Symmetry: D2
Subunit: 106 residues, 4 copies
């Protein structure tokens, strides 16, 4: 059926539902699951794309919007739109955020 | 009108860089504004500050699940098409602690 | 506490289905509440209604770009790895009018 | 370089930057671009995955959150969290939205 799984990054240690083994054709009691081992089951034509897709989604920019009101010093209240980008270093920790801010009060 | 504003928030430094275009939409002075994240929140409507904090944290630090398709090759030589749902779980630091999720064999 | 509420908004019908759990967080009566999208907005803080409308519209109807990787095969027999960025452009109806974007040959 | 492109859904008519032709190895002046034609350039091992990925992203559920305050009849003001799912029919038109609403006022 649907296999549950958990990867521990720091160690690469991998945990697999019996469902997952059935899917991969591996053997529960014996097959020691690690990220590196997982990638050997991955079709060779696919290994490289899957690494880039993981990285893109996990380390790369996942944009997003926040709307909020601000208060000018003269008490004026503006509706802004903030477009947010995330910049992560190798580790995954935010290095910086950046983006635009649009005054929508029109 | 000064148009679109662009900005950078340094995490280590905490430094917040504003183009004069931002300062303009905020009604502030380049020369005199603290340029920090807190300073920004002091300028944000009081009724909105918690919400925004949560929405940021939710995007920068929350789970942002996704799919991946790929074939695997079983030990028995058989080829399988998989759908895999990924969930990320970070530490307060941003560092990814665990990924986790599900795989579906959709091989027909 | 009645806990989590779940809800469905029918588009054609405009009908809005609430579990009693929602009615509970809203302080309303199942038997007496109109169960429509407008009714919902009348119950939403006045300072928030425009924002929410925009955020919905932005998610349901806005561009939601994405990536796709795949190999192509040139007429000359050569194999290439592509990165493709997709942007969707809908009609007020939701119907997708155009997709559009970019492709990068990342073949090494 | 980076190729620009536009697909017109209703017709499947396809528009291609010269950049795109260079990439696909096709010939600007002659090669008539359509969605169906595009898919013939797609590697055969990839054709099927690319269709499912398009569909998933374009017709499928793209969840999202909205936070907002409500007003109980007794003037009480609650902060809620709304989790939104989108349900599209074949056409792409929203059939319905659905989801949860969580009272955060704690």
């Amino acid at each position: 059926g649907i296999g549950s799984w958990v990867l521990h990054m720091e160690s690469g240690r991998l945990e697999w539902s019996q469902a997952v083994h059935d899917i991969f054709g591996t053997d529960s009691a014996t097959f020691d699951a690690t990220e590196d081992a997982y990638f050997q089951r991955v079709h060779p034509d696919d290994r490289a794309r899957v690494r880039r897709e993981l990285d893109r989604h996990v380390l790369g920019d996942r944009p997003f919007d926040v709307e909020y009101r601000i208060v000018r010093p003269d008490g004026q209240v503006r509706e802004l739109l903030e477009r947010n980008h995330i910049q992560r270093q190798a580790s995954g920790q935010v290095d910086h955020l950046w983006g635009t801010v649009i005054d929508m009060t029109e």
